[PDB]
Each structure stands twice: as structure tokens, then as C-alpha cells.
Green fluorescent protein (Aequorea victoria), 226 residues
Amino acid sequence: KSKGEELFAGVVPILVELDGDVNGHKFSVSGEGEGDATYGKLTLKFICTTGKLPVPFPTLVTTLVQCFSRYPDHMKRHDFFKSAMPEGYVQERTISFKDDGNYKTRAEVKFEGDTLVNRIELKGIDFKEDGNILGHKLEYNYNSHNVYITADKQKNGIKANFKIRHNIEDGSVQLADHYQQNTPIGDGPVLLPDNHCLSTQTVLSKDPNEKRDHMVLLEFVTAAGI
């Protein structure tokens, strides 16, 4: 049993902190909850702490801890994310919304004490003011997706590629292309995986008594040799 695996054998508290700027509109999001990697399960509530969120909350889901994925027994040697812990890893993305702008993100995810922390900076540019994003034209829901993971031996890390489909109010879909790189923060050994996918399902809801702009999230993720 790996050092990293052991850290995730039980329920782990999670803190997420996001600092964003999209087309000059600045915002912060704070998240609190817990993860149970044994079940590939995340439960979190995110709050926009700067008032009204200038983008749709679903566009921030991928940015807002893949170390909580369930890796089946036969796939544990492919779990790069837990192998990097507790020192953690840097996770960077470019998220390109088709016919619209893009996010660039850089996050560090690591333990601070007993708490798994995801600290993110996000910059968004080239968005259309009457687009699906700044115009808030996305449905408040989320589709199931496969995240395809490949090793990046050069950087002692991984890369991932996937396309998120955001349901649009008119029946269309807003595509968000993700290109992702993860690299270890520490210089101890990590697990470099064979190609595989993370099958992820997420359910978005609201607290009817929460008056702040917010997002309640439940997520199930399991690795598949697929």
C-alpha cells in the first residue's frame, strides 16, 4: 500500500480557493466539503465570495481534485494523483470554449495538515459579452464525461485531454476543450500511468436557504482501463 494511497483511505476534508478574472471581471470562489476516494466520491459547496459570479458556475466545475478518483485494485499502479501526495502537484489547463473565449488555469493541490487543498488562479480572455458564458446562457446541470489520461515522462507527470459539453438553454451544446498538464511538486517517486480514462459523473444542486451565488456539487469518478 502506497504512502499516497493511505492518505486517501478515509474521508478527507477539502478546501478549494479560486481567484479569477474573466474579461476584467474579478471574482473569488471558496469551496468546502469532503472526499472519499474509496468510493470515488466528492461532496462540496462552492460560494462566490465577491458577490455575483460573472460566469456560469458550471463553466468552473473542472477547475474547482482528481486525487479523489476511485482507482480499482487492478489499476492502482496508474494513480498519478495520489502518488504525488502529500507534497502535491501543479495542475494547469487551457479551456477553450468554441466560438468564444478561453480560461487558463494554474492550481496547486496538496495537503495542508489533514486537509486536501486546491488553490487556483484563473484568467479568462476573448469572451463575447452576449455569448453563452458572459451572457449566462448555460443550463445549471452537467453531463458525464471521460477524461483521457496519458503519461508525460519528460515532466514526470501526466497530460489529459477531453471536451466538456455544456447544455445551452436553446437546445444547443457549448463545447469546452480541455488541455491539461499535471506535474509533481515534490521530487519523490510518482506513478506514471498507462493510457486510461476517468469516468466522471457530476450532479449540481442548490441550497434553497443559501442566498449567496453558490453551487452544491456531488461527483463520482472511477478510473477505467478503457
About this structure: The radius of gyration is 17 Å.
